[PDB]
C-alpha cells in the first residue's frame, strides 16, 4: 500500500496543477470546451475576470 498512495497523491497533484490557470490583470480569458464557449446566466457568453480559475 506504499506505491499506490504516492502514485495517487502525485497524479492528483499533477491533475490539479494542470487544472489551475490564472488570468493576468491586463487580460481577460475566454474558455473553450471542445469548440463552443461556456454559457452562463441564460445563455450569455462568460468572460473571466483577472483571477485564478479552474479548468477541466
Amino acid at each position: 500500500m506504499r506505491k499506490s498512495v504516492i502514485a495517487i497523491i502525485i497524479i492528483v497533484l499533477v491533475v490539479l496543477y494542470m487544472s489551475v490557470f490564472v488570468v493576468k490583470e491586463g487580460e481577460r480569458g475566454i474558455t473553450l470546451r471542445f469548440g463552443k464557449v461556456l454559457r452562463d446566466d441564460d445563455n450569455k457568453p462568460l468572460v473571466y475576470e483577472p483571477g485564478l480559475h479552474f479548468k477541466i
Binding site: 473553450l32 471542445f34 469548440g35 463552443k36 464557449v37
Partner: peptide, 27 residues
C-alpha cells in the same frame, strides 16, 4: 469467445472514431 472480443473491438472502434468537435465559429 474470440468472436465476442472482435465484436467488442469493432464496436469500440466505431464509438471512438465517431466523435468529432467543431469550433464555435463553425457550423
Amino acid at each position: 469467445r474470440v468472436v465476442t472480443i472482435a465484436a467488442a473491438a469493432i464496436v469500440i472502434i466505431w464509438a471512438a472514431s465517431g466523435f468529432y468537435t467543431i469550433k464555435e465559429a463553425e457550423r
